[PDB]
Amino acid sequence: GPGLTDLFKTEKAAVKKMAKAIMADPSKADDVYQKWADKGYTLTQLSDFLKSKTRGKYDRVYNGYMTYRDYV
Numbered sequence: 137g138p139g140l141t142d143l144f145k146t147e148k149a150a151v152k153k154m155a156k157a158i159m160a161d162p163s164k165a166d167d168v169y170q171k172w173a174d175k176g177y178t179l180t181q182l183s184d185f186l187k188s189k190t191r192g193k194y195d196r197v198y199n200g201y202m203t204y205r206d207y208v
Contacts, residue, residue: 142188151177151185155197162200169201173208 137149158165172182179202186194 147177147181148185148187151182152188155186155194158197158200159193162196165200169204172201173204179205 137143137145137152142149142152154168154171158168179198182198182201186198188194
């Protein structure tokens with residue numbers, strides 16, 4: 137982003153955009169879940185993107201996402 141902690145603008149800064157977007161709205165989540173498998177975004181890297189922690193911010197988002205491991 138435009139910060140020092142997340143000074144990136146690549147994937148890890150890209151995924152946070154959708155993370156916080158799913159954080160609130162779980163309807164649009166389906167597309168992004170597919171988009172993640174679409175590029176082969178693996179959960180272990182997902183934890184790098186959503187590395188930062190905030191209550192209700194990242195938890196909802198990746199805890200729901202990790203369920204894809206039992207699907208594909």
